[PDB]
Amino acid sequence: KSRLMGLEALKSHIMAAKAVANTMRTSLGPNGLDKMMVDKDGDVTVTNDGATILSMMDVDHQIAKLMVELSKSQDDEIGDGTTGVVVLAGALLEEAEQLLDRGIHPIRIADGYEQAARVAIEHLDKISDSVLVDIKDTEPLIQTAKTTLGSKVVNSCHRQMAEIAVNAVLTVADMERRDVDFELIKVEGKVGGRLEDTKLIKGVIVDKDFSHPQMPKKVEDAKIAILTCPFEPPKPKTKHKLDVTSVEDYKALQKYEKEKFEEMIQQIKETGANLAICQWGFDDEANHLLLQNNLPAVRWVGGPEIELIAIATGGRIVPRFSELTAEKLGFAGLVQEISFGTTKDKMLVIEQCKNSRAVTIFIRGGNKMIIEEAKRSLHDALCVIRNLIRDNRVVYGGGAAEISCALAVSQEADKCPTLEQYAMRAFADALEVIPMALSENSGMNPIQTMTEVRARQVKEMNPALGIDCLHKGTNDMKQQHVIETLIGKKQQISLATQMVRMILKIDDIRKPGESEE
Amino acid sequence: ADEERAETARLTSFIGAIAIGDLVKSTLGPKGMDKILLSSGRDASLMVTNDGATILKNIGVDNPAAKVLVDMSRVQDDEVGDGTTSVTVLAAELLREAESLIAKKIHPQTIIAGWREATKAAREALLSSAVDHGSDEVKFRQDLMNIAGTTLSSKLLTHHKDHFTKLAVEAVLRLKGSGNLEAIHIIKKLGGSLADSYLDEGFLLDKKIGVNQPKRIENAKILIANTGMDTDKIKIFGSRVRVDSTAKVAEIEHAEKEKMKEKVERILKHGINCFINRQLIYNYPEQLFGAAGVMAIEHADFAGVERLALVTGGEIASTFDHPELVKLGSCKLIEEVMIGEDKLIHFSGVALGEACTIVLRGATQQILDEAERSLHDALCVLAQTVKDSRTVYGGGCSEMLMAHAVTQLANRTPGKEAVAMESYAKALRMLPTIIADNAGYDSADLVAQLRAAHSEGNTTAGLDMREGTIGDMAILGITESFQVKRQVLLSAAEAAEVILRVDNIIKA
Amino acid sequence: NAGYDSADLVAQLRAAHSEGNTTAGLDMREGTIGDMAILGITESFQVKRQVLLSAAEAAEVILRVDNIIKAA
Amino acid sequence: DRDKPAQIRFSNISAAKAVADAIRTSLGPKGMDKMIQDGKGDVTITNDGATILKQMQVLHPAARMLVELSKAQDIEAGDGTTSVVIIAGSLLDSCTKLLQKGIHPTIISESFQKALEKGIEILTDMSRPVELSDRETLLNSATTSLNSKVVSQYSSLLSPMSVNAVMKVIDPATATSVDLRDIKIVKKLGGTIDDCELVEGLVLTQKVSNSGITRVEKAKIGLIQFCLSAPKTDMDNQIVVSDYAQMDRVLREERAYILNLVKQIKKTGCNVLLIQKSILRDALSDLALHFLNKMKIMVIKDIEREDIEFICKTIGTKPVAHIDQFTADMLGSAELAEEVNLNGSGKLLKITGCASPGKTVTIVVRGSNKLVIEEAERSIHDALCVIRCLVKKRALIAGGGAPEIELALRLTEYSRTLSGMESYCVRAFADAMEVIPSTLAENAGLNPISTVTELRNRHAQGEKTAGINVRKGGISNILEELVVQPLLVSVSALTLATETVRSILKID
């Protein structure tokens, strides 16, 4: 194989770094123009989302490696911020060429990017120190879910989504805990609904319902019998499923399998519950018996969901039918089979007003692209919202923060006479590329457009108002309500600024060429 | 992954719908030209296609941008009807419009609202010359009739047009508040009739009577059966395998002939002379069922008695085991109607009721296929003509009016995007242009004059590009429900601005 | 020439003259759309009618010559 | 359609930047001097750009523009020569980027052209006034500004000659511009740097008078811009060639004229006759010229007409092409007119004092050889120019591009506050500055990058707590050892460059 060093590597790193910053820059923000992306499979994905673009790209290099990696630490915690962290890393790398071309060693600038990465996140700190409680922040949660639902263009009237993300974060992730819960938030949805068909389910919706509507739709508080046990074909994991191969076998199994389920569905109710959640469902034969034995219960519960309805409800674990006991049961504040407004989306909810250990946002949509349109949008909302419901620290987005940063950055950059005097100043120059590439997408000349904000910063020297991010012509950060959590913007940088510098410290690469990923 | 940057992406955005649009813009518009599908990737074939999808889907759509419209234009056709050829050309028009504005170095975003807002005010100007024709039922008749004949047009239909413009409106004038595809029962076969079709009293069914069965059934009370017998009747004992060797292989066929006989026990219990079921029986079975003396009709159609039960006032049900799980159907006759050489067992309980059977007799399926869609398309445009009885002047006259207004608008309306609105307005008059030379006529004057001419208020007077002449859109009958035209405006305007805003395409 | 957006300044001035404002025009000093008040940005009627002429003629005049025999 | 101009502009700015880059090594005294074999295949050895750029040059128009831009700084200041070449490509480094960055060429021009004035204005803040009225101070400061540079050799002697010649023709305390217009620089082969001296009247070419008195005081300064000769055939004597009596008699024609033409010269009368070179004549009759000086008029022949032009103005001897033009006004009035063959070797008519407008000075440049004469000239030319600049610019500024390292910070700082599309430009405008002293920090040897970066902060502190000190070639106060220059060479290089860079942006 081969070892490429210095300028070779220098042209190995920024090269693969430069192009993917470009696909996202015309994808950048709400005006970022979406990208249809098609697999070898005949697939089609219209993506302005970098992480989705990165999920769409298997493209090959340590950069393309780190890129698919870098955004998705921003996309879960903070959500929105996925796009800027990469494109700006390229812009930083875009600079380091000319800046090493000035004869400043890549590690001579390297600290200067991070050194001046301080002022930006430090300047972000200055923007809005506000932190609001759930019931107060819920408007800023949806006011940010104005923006953080905005980029996917599923936002207004989706204040449903915006509000269901308010409680979904609060329900499981506390405000004081500030340990991220996207794991105990259950992201859920189904095709055939509608974007405006939207709900936050507090407990667990199990997809299948009671074996009949001829038995009540409603199981009361708790009494959920947690069951791994066949009332339909078991398909056990220890042996293999086979069915009856003989004529006398359909005779006896029909007669045998009925009276046991008669006994067992009674034995469930003997052990007791108004709901038996079975990993292995009721058959249609066992359905009429759940009717005949006069018990409500769920037929099908997921193999994992038998843990879910156990944990997510806090319901005390009943492993199986043989472990059935009265004191151990799955729990509910109530149990319903809920039509969501489109009977196509129909679930049996085990709902938690007692303890929700998995809170379920249930989105709906005409199809899957539309619910995912909502969900990743709801995600980034739910993300920033959770960030904000932890600490409501916000910042006016669209770069007017960075336009205010870059000036203060490059100034405070010059203060250290060390060669990063200049190098940190060039760092600030990169802070201006995202609203730039946004102003491109906005239909505006970013050059003049930023200088409007520059002038506005010359006016303000912090973002309050700003330029367009959505394309309107009312140029505001505050009144347009272009606002991001103050956290993730700093996290964008922290993710954006070092990877460059980290790639700066690693130019020594054994490769025949870039494509090794 | 293959990264497609904007240079070819916008270009590929343009080529996809244009390269198919040119094919359908022949078919679409008035008729000076069509698509003759010359078919070989799959075969040796020669085909004549006015259908967009038959042009679209048969040919390779593999362009990711062509994927959009071939997917999106079909739905528009699958929704309101005749949207394949429409959403394709009209966005392909915009692709040309974008291309210049692209080549003019203009933000696609700047082009978005420029078209997208222009889409509205055109749909608004579309709503202007949209003229409600619901006045009387005779108006609503001839509205639907003009509209039914509107979608059927620019397509090859032999005897279809004049009969369904009766039927489609007949299906409308019975349901009153919608049209009936739930009622019209399309029955296709080889009758030797060219396109010739008719409203079928009751519903005919295709079987040869023979063996011992007398062919005609009189005073027939049908016993509705949702479950018949295939060959062996299915129940507890219904299956056996005795085969230990090659003799039994020939001897197992003989064992199941017994199972045909026990089927008689079930039907002889019900007692009704006429037993009509879903599942067919064969001629050697006909020996056992016909010698039983009761008349057991095989393959009696669900939608057929669904016709009856609606019109006869009775109940067609599901899950038939014993006679009363479905309310007994009442027909006047179970008869054999002989059409040419055909022998068709024909159930007549009612005539031309609010559920009709429609017998489509043709020697070719493709025409019967494209006849169904244009019928499937018209009734939808007729069912929305039940809702919106505005029939907006078609044949490009709508394009003109919208092109004139939006141009007038772009003049004042933006300070910049007057680029795209007129560009939008330009794409409007496009569809008119391609077909006038197809009559030999000069579109330029037309789109210049007759637009401004009828956008100065001749709006009824409009484009006959079959004759290449200026004629009245209402009197020529060239016009259609305000929805479908706006509906074919909705997707195509949306279809273009998607790949327009697409500046990169990943390819795995 | 002033390096400003024409489709902007034109379609603005279009909208301006679509509102019939000829007292507002492209003011090419700063290169915005602005008043024609006779700021100095206004021209004598002599020039345009003259300048509007020969090219609106010659271009057509050039369109008449089609067969062009060059004996060189 | 404007593609090619950008391409041309590229091709312009490229070969523009190109030729300006090669000097950025030879920039400065530590700038390395290039022995250059030329199209003549022969070595040529110089440091300053102008000579280098002229002595080997091909033709690129932008390059042709820069050798002028080079010459400009020369013909403008006679000073800061090497500097203007370095700033152009430095600016173009910003421009080409900004052009790539997309900043419209008209913008960048008026961007940097506006930003120009801001730079030299902060330079006026950097500017340190020295006394233009005090000859001593000028003798002190300019020589020190020359001691900021290479040559004190004859200068520290010839600055007493330079500052005086200037001071003598200095009317104002401001001392204004003072081109060398009133300073006549003439050499004399023999003599010394000490025999180099200022003289108060115009030394005339040799003294060419045949019978003309070696000295005539209170000299009417005659000028002969017309021939002394009767018509020619084969000599001043007009010779028709067959037999020798005709050419003997046509003498009576020829002889009388050249006598009378001379008699006419002494009619109005002249004490001195300015006579330019006889090849700056068609020819001059010795026959006349004999009897000319034989009527006892002292004369100088063989003098340059541009001397005469210098003499027509500075002593106000009005041009005489004709005997009507023999008049006491057109015949200049000299206080004293003599010849000195002595005080060194060579002969020259010394006008010492005269009737003169604008004072007047001649310096007769002498030495042990021509070289001692030559560098003496090169010792004054700087002094001659640096004074007339330093007096042209009321204040003084320290050199080494440190004011730019100051100013590059200063404008970029305000270029923020400026904002506008040009903020990016006006920063990059100022950013162009520090590259030049960087190149010197490279040309003297140092880190051009490390230092000048730090100096921008050094120049953020005391604005000079450090600078680029050429003998140190490093971070130093340039006021501790003065590296100092008149304001002009700073302004000059700047004001030229932008304009030269400006039109190119506007050049297609």
From Swiss-Prot, chain A:
Top-level taxonomic group = Eukaryota
For this entry, list what GO says about its biological process. binding of sperm to zona pellucida; chaperone mediated protein folding independent of cofactor; chaperone-mediated protein folding; positive regulation of protein localization to Cajal body; positive regulation of telomerase RNA localization to Cajal body; positive regulation of telomere maintenance via telomerase; protein folding; protein stabilization
Q: Does the keyword Transmembrane apply?
A: no
Query: Which residues form each disulfide bond in the chain?
Result: none
Q: Which positions in this protein are listed as binding ADP?
A: 29, 81-83, 151, 398, 468, 484, 489
Keyword Acetylation attached: yes
Q: Which residues carry this modification: Phosphoserine?
A: 2, 322, 515
Catalytic activity field: ATP + H2O = ADP + phosphate + H(+)
Q: According to its record, what are the GO cellular component terms? A: cell body; centrosome; chaperonin-containing T-complex; cytosol; extracellular exosome; microtubule
Record PTM text? Ubiquitinated by the DCX(DCAF12) complex specifically recognizes the diglutamate (Glu-Glu) at the C-terminus, leading to its degradation.
What upregulates this protein?
Down-regulated in response to enterovirus 71 (EV71) infection (at protein level).
- Cross-link type Glycyl lysine isopeptide (Lys-Gly) (interchain with G-Cter in SUMO2), residue numbers: 186, 190, 241, 251, 255, 368
The identity of this protein, by name, is T-complex protein 1 subunit epsilon
Which species expresses this protein natively?
Answer: Homo sapiens
Its taxonomic placement starts with: Eukaryota, Metazoa, Chordata, Craniata, Vertebrata
Swiss-Prot record, chain C:
User: Which residues are listed for ATP binding in this entry?
Assistant: 43, 48
Tell where it localizes: Cytoplasm
Q: Which domain of life is it from?
A: Eukaryota
Binding sites annotated in the UniProt record for ADP: 43, 48
> What is the recorded function of this protein according to its Swiss-Prot or TrEMBL entry?
Component of the chaperonin-containing T-complex (TRiC), a molecular chaperone complex that assists the folding of actin, tubulin and other proteins upon ATP hydrolysis. The TRiC complex mediates the folding of WRAP53/TCAB1, thereby regulating telomere maintenance. As part of the TRiC complex may play a role in the assembly of BBSome, a complex involved in ciliogenesis regulating transports vesicles to the cilia.
- State the family named in the UniProt similarity comment for this chain: Belongs to the TCP-1 chaperonin family.
Tell me how this protein assembles: Component of the chaperonin-containing T-complex (TRiC), a hexadecamer composed of two identical back-to-back stacked rings enclosing a protein folding chamber. Each ring is made up of eight different subunits: TCP1/CCT1, CCT2, CCT3, CCT4, CCT5, CCT6A/CCT6, CCT7, CCT8. Interacts with PACRG. Interacts with FLCN. Interacts with DLEC1. Interacts with SVEP1.
Q: What is the protein name stated in its UniProt record?
A: T-complex protein 1 subunit beta
Source lineage: Eukaryota, Metazoa, Chordata, Craniata, Vertebrata
Q: Gene name, please?
A: CCT2
Span within the entire protein? 453 to 524 of 535
UniProtKB/Swiss-Prot annotation, chain D:
UniProt GO molecular function:
ATP binding; ATP hydrolysis activity; ATP-dependent protein folding chaperone; protein folding chaperone; RNA binding; unfolded protein binding
Q: Which residues form a coiled coil?
A: none
Q: What class of enzyme is it?
A: hydrolase
GO CC terms of this entry? cell body; cell projection; centrosome; chaperonin-containing T-complex; cytosol; extracellular exosome; melanosome; microtubule
Q: Signal sequence: where? A: none
Spell out which residues are annotated as carrying Phosphoserine: 11, 159, 177, 419
Q: Which residues bind Mg(2+)?
A: 79
Subunit structure as annotated in this protein's UniProt entry: Component of the chaperonin-containing T-complex (TRiC), a hexadecamer composed of two identical back-to-back stacked rings enclosing a protein folding chamber. Each ring is made up of eight different subunits: TCP1/CCT1, CCT2, CCT3, CCT4, CCT5, CCT6A/CCT6, CCT7, CCT8. Interacts with PACRG. Interacts with DNAAF4. Interacts with DLEC1.
Q: What does this protein do?
A: Component of the chaperonin-containing T-complex (TRiC), a molecular chaperone complex that assists the folding of actin, tubulin and other proteins upon ATP hydrolysis. The TRiC complex mediates the folding of WRAP53/TCAB1, thereby regulating telomere maintenance. As part of the TRiC complex may play a role in the assembly of BBSome, a complex involved in ciliogenesis regulating transports vesicles to the cilia.
Q: What name has this protein been given in UniProt? A: T-complex protein 1 subunit delta
Q: Which organism is it from?
A: Homo sapiens (Human)
